[PDB]
C-alpha cells in the first residue's frame, strides 16, 4: 500500500489510518527519536507539519511541488491547537507568548 493524498480525519486533520481506507503510515515516537539521533531537523519539521498536520501549509507545499519549487511553509500543527482548546475547556488558561 502507498498513499500520496486522500482522506483526512476530522477532529485532527491528520491523514486516515488503514488499508481499507486510503491512509498513510504512522510515524511513531521511536522514529522521531531516530531522526533526532541524526541532526535531521528539516526532515522532522516537514514530517510533522506539512505532510500531516498544517492544513494551509500542506496545500502551499502541494502547489510548490507541482510548480517545482520544493519549499515548505510549516506554520503550526493543528492538532496542537486542538490540544490547547482541550486544556482551555478546563479551568486552565494556557496561551502562547510573544517574548
Amino acid at each position: 500500500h502507498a498513499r500520496s493524498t486522500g482522506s483526512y480525519s476530522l477532529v485532527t486533520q491528520q491523514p486516515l489510518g488503514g488499508k481499507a481506507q486510503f491512509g498513510g503510515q504512522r510515524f511513531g515516537e521511536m522514529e522521531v527519536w531516530a531522526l533526532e539521533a541524526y541532526g535531521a531537523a528539516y526532515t522532522l519539521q516537514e514530517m510533522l507539519t506539512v505532510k500531516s498536520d498544517d492544513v494551509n501549509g500542506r496545500t502551499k507545499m502541494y502547489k510548490n511541488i507541482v510548480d517545482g519549487n520544493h519549499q515548505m511553509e510549516p506554520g503550526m500543527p493543528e492538532s496542537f491547537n486542538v490540544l490547547l482548546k482541550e486544556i482551555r475547556s478546563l479551568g486552565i488558561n494556557i496561551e502562547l507568548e510573544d517574548e
Binding site: 541532526g39 535531521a40 531537523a41 528539516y42
Partner: peptide
Amino acid sequence: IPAGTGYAYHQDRMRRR
C-alpha cells in the same frame, strides 16, 4: 529541534542578536 541543522539555525539566530 534545537539539534543538528535546527541547532545551526538557532545558533545563527542567537549569534545574530
